[PDB]
């Protein structure tokens, strides 16, 4: 459950948790450990930085 841990307060998206999640933890966009405590929080923050792709993401 992420929606139960969604923070539309800091999250730039106020549509759905899946949206902001579909962004960070979507493989592209602005994935990272930042979205961990940006739109969500642990232990969800772990999923954000988890489903944020590994090397498939736009990482260095």
What features would you describe in this structure?
The protein has 60 residues and is an all-alpha fold. The protein has one domain: Pheromone ER-1 (Up-down Bundle). 20% of the residues lie in helices and 0% in strands. It is built from 2 helices and no strands. The chain has helices at 17-24, 45-48. It is globular and about 30 Å long. The termini are far apart. The PDB classes it as signaling protein. The entry lists the keywords Euplotes nobilii pheromone, disulfide-rich protein, all alpha helical, signaling protein.
First-last Cα distance: 30 Å
How would you sum up the major sheet?
none
Net shape: globular
Structural class: mainly alpha
**What is the number of helical segments per DSSP (H or I, 4+ residues)?**
2
Strand content: under 5%
Protein name: Mating pheromone En-2
GO molecular function, one term: pheromone activity
Main location: secreted
Keywords: Disulfide bond, Pheromone, Secreted
């Amino acid at each position: 459950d992420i929606e139960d841990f969604y923070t539309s307060e800091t999250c730039p998206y106020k549509n759905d948790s899946q949206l902001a999640w579909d962004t960070c933890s979507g493989g592209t966009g602005n994935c990272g450990t930042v979205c961990c405590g940006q739109c969500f929080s642990f232990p969800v923050s772990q999923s954000c930085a988890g489903m944020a792709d590994s090397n498939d993401c736009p990482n260095a």
